[PDB]
Symmetry: C3
Amino acid sequence: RAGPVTWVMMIACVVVFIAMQILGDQEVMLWLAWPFDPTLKFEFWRYFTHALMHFSLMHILFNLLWWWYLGGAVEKRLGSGKLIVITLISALLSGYVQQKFSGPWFGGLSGVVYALMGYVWLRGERDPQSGIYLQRGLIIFALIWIVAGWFDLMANGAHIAGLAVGLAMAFVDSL
Amino acid sequence: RAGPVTWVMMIACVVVFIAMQILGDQEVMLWLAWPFDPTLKFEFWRYFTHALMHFSLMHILFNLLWWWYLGGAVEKRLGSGKLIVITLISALLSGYVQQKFSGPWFGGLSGVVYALMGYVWLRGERDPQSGIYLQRGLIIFALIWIVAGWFDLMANGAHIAGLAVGLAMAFVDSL
Amino acid sequence: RAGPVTWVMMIACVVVFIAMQILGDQEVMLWLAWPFDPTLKFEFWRYFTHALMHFSLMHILFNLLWWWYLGGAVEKRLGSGKLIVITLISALLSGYVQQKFSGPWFGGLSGVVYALMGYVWLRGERDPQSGIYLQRGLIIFALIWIVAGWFDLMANGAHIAGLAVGLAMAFVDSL
Ligand SMILES: *P(=O)(OC(C)C)OC(C)C
Ligand SMILES: *P(=O)(OC(C)C)OC(C)C
Ligand SMILES: *P(=O)(OC(C)C)OC(C)C
């Protein structure tokens, strides 16, 4: 089954998505969004909580599906700590790039998912003996969620940041 | 493979969905919908057939996916009879609540699916030795179809009736 | 994993779908569409490349999902050559019927997918000893993608051509 990190992230996303339905999106953004005023700059959770918000059924479903499968595999094969670090770094960096191009009104797990996509693919190519890889079939469908992101079907710089982080980390780990 | 009950329900839903495309939704409602005039009150199938109608591709697909997996597991592990009773009771009760709040113009397998969700989850927690349970990952995605229902993303009373029936039955069976 | 034919078809579809996002649909049609002027009648790839174009995320995703599973199983169980021939014949014939009813502005893998659906189902019924079959559950969901096609939820003649080819071939192979 899904490890504690994979699992708790899913719970958090659902609860937050529930709170968004009840109180409204903007009400919830006010509390969880990347700091959107200087008075909010020391509320450190805001640098990470943006990733917990989803704006439609399909948004949370595809993010949670990918997180479940990829985050789930990383945690099981490489440990909770690894999942935690990949998650914290991609959220922060994709969040910062996103905000820089398009402002602080955004949310979603996809920066993290892209990181997990980049990481799991590069790690499987370069370090097969790790037991972790992205299957051919799934590479195709990962590329589709990825293309959905690049052509607004997020800021593509944030997209890139998500991916890059995953790649850079997979690269370091292969060494 | 899928048992006779799981299987026949899927066939029926598809055929009915096909008849809906050909003749139109309303034409089919006229025959399968919860009684919508006193002249129709003795046509007993109407208390159950409302559940066989779907109004979009995504409506039937998600209902049939969940029914396939959950109904399929109940039938295999606990027997066709159990599936039949859960199905008949949730359809009737969710149907009655639905109609009471929003009138007789409705359809879909989701009252039943919610029952199966409630039943399979509660049964797995309380009676593990039964071989039946809802995995962590799937709990998350069940909650999403459930939230899709509660926030009209059905009458939530009907929603509750569906769930309650599943829970009440799982509760009795754990004893 | 997915064989070379199953795999290369997916790559081609994604790359083409990418080129469609960048250059636009019509720009790409101009090069890959069924001949739409006599000057183009000797460009033989056009009789097959129409199948590589997809017009939405859901279009390519469902086609590629089905192709992945069904094409993947055919190639693994019966060989790359078989997949190649089914693919070439259904593309050509469904493409020709499509164009005859609705003109040369169309694209998609679904004519091929329907062929694979017809082929895998009929082959499993008639030649069980072949190791290839369409499971009950999946029959239901195949019928849904099929119904999505028939009721424009393609020209149904093309739909039929796709299916027929799959059936005719499964029929010949059962002998
Ligand atoms: P991601 O969760 O999803 C994109 C595919 C739109 O979005 C960014 C804002 C993290
Ligand atoms: P369900 O089939 O689906 C809901 C999620 C809308 O609907 C009721 C009417 C049974
Ligand atoms: P297919 O790829 O998809 C249909 C379900 C619309 O379409 C034809 C044009 C091949």
